[PDB]
């Protein structure tokens, strides 16, 4: 009821992930969030299931949702997946960034809601969207 | 006529850029690609003229123009300023994530040129984005 909303990092790679989430958490003074490296040799279902895992321990402090923030291919899948097999509310985020990463962690540690966190999120999407739209005009 | 497109990967953070750069290598065997990664403490005049430098030391290999691949604010700059500065055709991407280095190099490797690697990338950007928030 009072649990922040869980903030997991997962991408492609040997320290993505990791290395966005210490810059945000180094920017924002706080450990929280938890960041997974997906290095290229390992199985999809082999991530899923380190994730789970953790998910599962931390049941009870992940009482507000979690969001999942990824890069690409299957890794979003996993949101749903997670809801499914534990009951958790997930949101999951694809084509995540550094600031991506900052914003969730920054919104997450003040207690702002899942859906709070999911909807400034898209803003951020969509205010980029309209920045690359309008350089492409010149 | 034959240069490649300059991809530079500039992230903030202890490995950022050097890993995503390293996913899409590894994805796509090919060793194309800059990668910088900026520590915290770095100033942003630093960060800028660690570009430039590399950049001026190299200018035939990048007559074909330079893609900046960045994430936040400071380094969004960068793009126009190189280009005021050097007279080398840059564009310039924000947000950037592991799906963007890997199709910017993906192409530049396969001698696309800046106009169509930038066109791309936004439109790819845009769509995934848009499936991402629909339902």
Aim: glycine letters at 6%; a negative charge; proline letters at 1%.
């Amino acid at each position: 009821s009072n649990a922040n909303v869980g903030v997991f990092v997962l991408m492609h790679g040997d320290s993505t992930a990791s290395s966005m989430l210490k810059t945000a958490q180094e920017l924002l003074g706080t450990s929280i969030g938890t960041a997974m490296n997906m290095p290229l040799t390992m199985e999809v279902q082999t991530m899923y299931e380190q994730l789970r895992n953790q998910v599962i321990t931390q049941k009870e402090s992940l009482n507000n949702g979690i969001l999942l923030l990824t890069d690409m291919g299957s890794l979003n899948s996993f949101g749903n997946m997670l809801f499914e097999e534990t009951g958790i509310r997930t949101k999951a985020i694809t084509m995540t960034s550094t600031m991506i990463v900052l914003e969730a962690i920054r919104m997450a540690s003040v207690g702002r809601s899942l859906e709070d966190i999911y909807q400034n999120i898209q803003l951020s999407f969509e205010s980029v969207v309209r920045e690359q739209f309008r350089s492409s005009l010149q």
